Write a protein that binds this ligand. Sequence first.
Ligand SMILES: [Ca+2]
Ligand SMILES: [Ca+2]
Ligand SMILES: [Mg+2]
Ligand SMILES: [Mg+2]
Ligand SMILES: [Mg+2]
Ligand SMILES: [Mg+2]
Ligand SMILES: [Mg+2]
Ligand SMILES: [Mg+2]
Lengths: 236, 236, 6, 6
Amino acid sequence: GAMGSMERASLIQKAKLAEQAERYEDMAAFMKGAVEKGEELSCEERNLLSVAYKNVVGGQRAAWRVLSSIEQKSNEEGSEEKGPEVREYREKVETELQGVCDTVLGLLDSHLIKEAGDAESRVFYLKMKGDYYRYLAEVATGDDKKRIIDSARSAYQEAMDISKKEMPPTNPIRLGLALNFSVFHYEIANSPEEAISLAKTTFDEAMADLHTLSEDSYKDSTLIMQLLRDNLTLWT
Amino acid sequence: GAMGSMERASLIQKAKLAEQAERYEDMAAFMKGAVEKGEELSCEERNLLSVAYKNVVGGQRAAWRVLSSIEQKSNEEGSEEKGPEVREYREKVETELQGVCDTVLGLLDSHLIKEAGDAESRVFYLKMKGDYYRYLAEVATGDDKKRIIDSARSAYQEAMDISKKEMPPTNPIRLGLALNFSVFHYEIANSPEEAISLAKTTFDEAMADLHTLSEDSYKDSTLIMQLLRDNLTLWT
Amino acid sequence: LQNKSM
Amino acid sequence: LQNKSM
Ligand SMILES: [Ca+2]
Ligand SMILES: [Ca+2]
Ligand SMILES: [Mg+2]
Ligand SMILES: [Mg+2]
Ligand SMILES: [Mg+2]
Ligand SMILES: [Mg+2]
Ligand SMILES: [Mg+2]
Ligand SMILES: [Mg+2]
């Protein structure tokens, strides 16, 4: 790999510089190199990895949605024929998005998840596995769509089981996992009632645990609780 | 080139899709392929080329400025030594920025400028040559800094001479050229008085020509005149 | 609007 | 602020 000759600490240092410069493709490549050094990742390092790829795939997903919309319009009644270009370019962006998802999933499988033993790291990585299968599911249309969806579900479910046993209801990772699993139910699995029930129960159980928290932790938790509330207001 | 097998019209079509998706690296590669087909560019096609590379290099310049600031701070009195990483990563971004500038200048030299005979196309391309030498000048520090600066100046000057002879004072290309040449004087050539004089005279001569214009042209011209005013307010 | 995720 | 260019 092109990062094989750079020190682990230098890769982390440059990942932080890339974030400051909003160079998220660079940031992702640096953190991929850090992961490939083979040592487990600290809490801060895990969040550098997630920030980098979240931003990269976020831009690809937004672009895919623009192109997919143009493509759907082109196939309505009365739309003039413009050739294969829209499909081709949507396919180009889709393939690059799938490549990024495959890269993240490959890092999780080789070998982040199997070495992660603490609840905070294991839940974090399983949530990530669910997230990137969900992004694959957003663009899937063929023979493997159902297996892609079930792979996202299974990863989210394993993470949920651990988080409920090992973390308090206000833990930001637990809350973000539940938020995203709820979105999976609503957007991918055609299960809006499950999405709503999960978001409500997660919100209510966190509300009842806020009294245990410091001011700084209270801020961290209520920020994510508001996102659950935003979705409930959108969905109901 | 990787775009050699794609139709000129398809490359233009996909450049417009990439703009809609805010995929400016793709947009630039598509328009580079279109230029390399060897035919002259229409007014719309020229502006697709400029939009694409303006956005690509704009992101690189913003990132370079972030990193350069961090690097300058690292070299102040009392700053802890953190190793070569900041310089290395600034150099990495700088080299990619220079590569993009070289690519644009190469397209202008082979062979957009020499085939451009109408004032609107020739001024447009010479302004672009000035702009991308200016971006090279922003990061230049060595033996060739003075020659880089003079290359920007010479291209801007040739474009100015043509624009004054062949275009009305409200022409948006003429106005944008003068705006950018004024910025060159202020930011690159250490000539704030020249920058101010040029911006004022350009603004005043355009003001006196607005009466000749349609409502739509009046909007186009006054938009750029406001940018001249913004700079004058910042600089005085 | 869009679904919120983190 | 930043210099305006176009
Ligand atoms: Ca371990
Ligand atoms: Ca010609
Ligand atoms: Mg080492
Ligand atoms: Mg394509
Ligand atoms: Mg496909
Ligand atoms: Mg042809
Ligand atoms: Mg570097
Ligand atoms: Mg250099």
